[PDB]
Write a protein that binds this ligand. Structure first.
Ligand code: A1AW4
Length: 209
């Protein structure tokens, strides 16, 4: 049972700008997704300070980067607070409509495109490198769900029958044909060191056979 939803117009417009604007600095997608994971980890850590049972779904707070050259996917896994079904539908837990508006106003006032994450919509920078994004998520208060979009104005949400996750979020980037440099260990290591070197959770880059 798959539900198909239209993006709000303002979000669809931001996605079309990300996909169609000529912009060579595509590597910042990973900084943005790691930053989002760090924010989600901070949220479950804070909730656990007064309710330790919130970590019954998993005590380890970490970020894994999993390239798969056979599937041409880069997966960013975190064990943060995760998202409910309602969060997924509501722009993956973001204030994307007002965030997009503030980002566009900032660009008019001289901000850089790379500042997207300051406006709460850094997730959508995934489409700098991905033709399709799949988000699998488990929040303590809901079941495990899969969100997916290839842009084009729509996204889908379904219950996920896949490998149970415990708690957290997995962002699966189905990379564009010409963006497979982001599956190479040395390139991923370089971008993490450049942009994400002080994140306060362990970031493990998996290697491949
Ligand atoms: O936001 C981005 N591009 C963009 C291009 C033109 N106008 C607004 C935004 C990319 C960083 C993700």
């Amino acid at each position: 049972e798959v539900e198909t939803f239209a993006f709000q117009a303002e979000i669809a417009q931001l996605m079309s700008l990300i996909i169609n604007t000529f912009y060579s600095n595509k590597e910042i997608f990973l900084r943005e997704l790691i930053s989002n994971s760090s924010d989600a980890l901070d949220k479950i850590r804070y909730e656990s300070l007064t309710d330790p049972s919130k970590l019954d779904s998993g005590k380890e707070l970490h970020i894994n980067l999993i390239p798969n050259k056979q599937d041409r996917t880069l997966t960013i896994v975190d064990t943060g607070i995760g998202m409910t079904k309602a969060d997924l539908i509501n722009n993956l837990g973001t204030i994307a409509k007002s965030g997009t508006k503030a980002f566009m106003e900032a660009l008019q006032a001289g901000a850089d495109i790379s500042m997207i994450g300051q406006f709460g919509v850094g997730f959508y920078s995934a489409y700098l490198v991905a033709e399709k994004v799949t988000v699998i998520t488990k929040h303590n208060d809901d079941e495990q769900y899969a969100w997916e979009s290839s842009a084009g104005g729509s996204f889908t949400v379904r219950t996920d029958t896949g490998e149970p996750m415990g708690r957290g979020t997995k962002v699966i980037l189905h990379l564009k044909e010409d963006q497979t440099e982001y599956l190479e260990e040395r390139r991923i290591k370089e971008i993490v060191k450049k942009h994400s070197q002080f994140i306060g959770y362990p970031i493990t880059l998996f290697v491949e056979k």
